[PDB]
Design an enzyme around this catalytic site. Structure first.
Site, PDB file in Angstrom:
ATOM      1  N   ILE A  42       0.710  -1.176   0.067  1.00  0.00           N
ATOM      2  CA  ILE A  42       0.061   0.026   0.045  1.00  0.00           C
ATOM      3  C   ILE A  42       1.039   1.303   0.009  1.00  0.00           C
ATOM      4  CG2 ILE A  42      -1.882  -1.082   0.967  1.00  0.00           C
ATOM      5  CD1 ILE A  42      -1.267   0.333   3.723  1.00  0.00           C
ATOM      6  N   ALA A  43       2.149   1.176   0.377  1.00  0.00           N
ATOM      7  CA  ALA A  43       2.868   2.289   0.406  1.00  0.00           C
ATOM      8  C   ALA A  43       4.494   2.132   0.538  1.00  0.00           C
ATOM      9  CB  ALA A  43       2.647   3.271   1.394  1.00  0.00           C
ATOM     10  N   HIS A  44       5.391   2.727   0.054  1.00  0.00           N
ATOM     11  CA  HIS A  44       6.869   2.556   0.461  1.00  0.00           C
ATOM     12  C   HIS A  44       7.320   3.681   1.353  1.00  0.00           C
ATOM     13  CE1 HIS A  44      10.836   1.180  -0.442  1.00  0.00           C
ATOM     14  NE2 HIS A  44      11.382   2.401  -0.403  1.00  0.00           N
ATOM     15  N   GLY A  45       8.052   3.258   2.633  1.00  0.00           N
ATOM     16  CA  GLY A  45       8.364   3.875   3.569  1.00  0.00           C
ATOM     17  C   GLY A  45       9.844   4.146   3.893  1.00  0.00           C
ATOM     18  N   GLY A  48      11.128   0.514   4.293  1.00  0.00           N
ATOM     19  CA  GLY A  48      10.863  -0.143   3.120  1.00  0.00           C
ATOM     20  C   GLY A  48       9.209  -0.092   2.686  1.00  0.00           C
ATOM     21  N   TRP A  49       8.835  -1.333   2.263  1.00  0.00           N
ATOM     22  CA  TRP A  49       7.516  -1.316   1.637  1.00  0.00           C
ATOM     23  C   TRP A  49       6.552  -1.750   2.878  1.00  0.00           C
ATOM     24  CZ3 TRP A  49       5.926   0.136  -2.838  1.00  0.00           C
ATOM     25  CH2 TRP A  49       6.725   0.422  -4.021  1.00  0.00           C
ATOM     26  N   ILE A  50       5.456  -1.179   2.648  1.00  0.00           N
ATOM     27  CA  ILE A  50       4.272  -1.499   3.734  1.00  0.00           C
ATOM     28  C   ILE A  50       3.112  -2.328   3.009  1.00  0.00           C
ATOM     29  CG2 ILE A  50       2.624  -0.506   5.142  1.00  0.00           C
ATOM     30  CD1 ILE A  50       4.694   1.807   5.411  1.00  0.00           C
ATOM     31  N   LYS A  66       4.122  -3.628   8.681  1.00  0.00           N
ATOM     32  CA  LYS A  66       5.022  -2.580   8.876  1.00  0.00           C
ATOM     33  C   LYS A  66       6.339  -2.872   9.264  1.00  0.00           C
ATOM     34  CE  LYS A  66       5.448   2.610   9.519  1.00  0.00           C
ATOM     35  NZ  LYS A  66       5.001   3.517  10.262  1.00  0.00           N
ATOM     36  N   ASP A 157       4.911  12.146  16.386  1.00  0.00           N
ATOM     37  CA  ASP A 157       5.066  12.435  15.126  1.00  0.00           C
ATOM     38  C   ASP A 157       3.612  12.681  14.408  1.00  0.00           C
ATOM     39  OD1 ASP A 157       6.453  12.877  12.541  1.00  0.00           O
ATOM     40  OD2 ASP A 157       6.010  10.555  12.091  1.00  0.00           O
TER      41      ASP A 157
HETATM   42 MG   LIG Z   1       6.250   8.633  11.552  1.00  0.00          MG
END
Ligand SMILES: [Mg+2]
Length: 285
Positions: A42-45, A48-50, A66, A157
């Site tokens: 669903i996303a790259h953070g 790494g990938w999520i 995650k 955060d």
């Molecule tokens: Mg954060």
């Protein structure tokens, strides 16, 4: 001290994944920890990938995989604390697993189906939400922040991208950034939102108060960006027609983001009282 948010229809399951920086280490159909069937990413953070997966043990459950940040006693207590968080405004932590294909392991958390508040902002021509809607979103997440604070814990955060609007609710999704008040070591905030004292004095309720003020500012008005980072301070009413019309809003934002933590709102309840008062003023005129 909360208002009614518009209902946000969740995405259908056949529209949750993106098309795959490096290639993902897992693909659709892979089985993680003999429990989770991978659906995709669903996303790259930064970790790494999520990934998105089916939880086979719980009927209908979709989970997020995650990466975790890579003395077992202390780590066990911290994982149990995250797992036991009961507040519905915070994403649920279900498990912490390892995998031979991803050395750092995963935290297994609830998938919140909806756009982030940053996504809602980007869908507007001015890139911001209407001020009454943005205040309503902040008021909605304040019980979740306070739940953590009253248990000696801070979120660290807060920013528009890790608040997800789903149904008529919002949820905080960044469990990885949570620390105890006054925790030692490096704190994973985001520069531009994080309070200036954190890097030398550690986090506190007051530094969370700061991120709330920066988040509300980012939701409502254009903010100068310097070198990829939101410049410090609040725009002046001289430069912002919104703040010139709502001077009490300008004052609230400056107090919540005061350089001196002692001048900020003392806790979430004090902020809510003034914030709800600003909203009622805006809605009255
Ligand atoms: Mg954060």
């Amino acid at each position: 001290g909360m208002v009614e948010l518009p209902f946000i229809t969740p995405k259908p399951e056949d529209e949750l994944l993106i098309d795959p920086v490096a290639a993902p280490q897992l693909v659709a159909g892979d089985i993680v920890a003999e429990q989770y069937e991978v659906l995709g990413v669903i996303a790259h953070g930064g970790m790494g990938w999520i990934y998105l997966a089916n939880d086979r043990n719980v009927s209908g459950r979709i989970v997020v995989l995650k990466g975790m940040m890579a003395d077992q006693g202390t780590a066990e207590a911290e994982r149990e604390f995250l797992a036991d968080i009961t507040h519905p405004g915070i994403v649920k932590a279900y498990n912490f697993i390892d995998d031979p294909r991803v050395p750092g392991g995963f935290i297994v958390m609830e998938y919140v189906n909806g756009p982030s508040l940053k996504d809602r902002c980007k869908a507007q021509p001015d890139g911001v939400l209407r001020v009454d809607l943005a205040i309503g979103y902040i008021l909605e997440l304040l019980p979740a922040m306070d739940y953590l604070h009253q248990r000696g814990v801070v979120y660290n955060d807060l920013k528009p991208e890790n608040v997800i609007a789903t149904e008529d609710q919002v949820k905080l999704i960044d469990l990885g950034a949570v620390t105890g008040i006054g925790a030692f070591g490096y704190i994973y905030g985001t520069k531009g939102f994080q309070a200036p004292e954190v890097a030398t004095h550690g986090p506190s309720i007051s530094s969370d108060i700061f991120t709330i003020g920066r988040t509300l500012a980012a939701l409502t008005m254009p903010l100068p960006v310097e070198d990829g980072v939101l410049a410090p301070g609040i725009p002046s009413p001289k430069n912002s027609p919104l703040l010139r019309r709502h001077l009490s809003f300008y004052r609230l934002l400056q107090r919540a983001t005061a350089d001196d933590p002692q001048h900020r709102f003392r806790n979430v309840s004090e902020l809510r009282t003034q914030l709800y008062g600003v909203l009622r003023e805006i809605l009255a005129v």
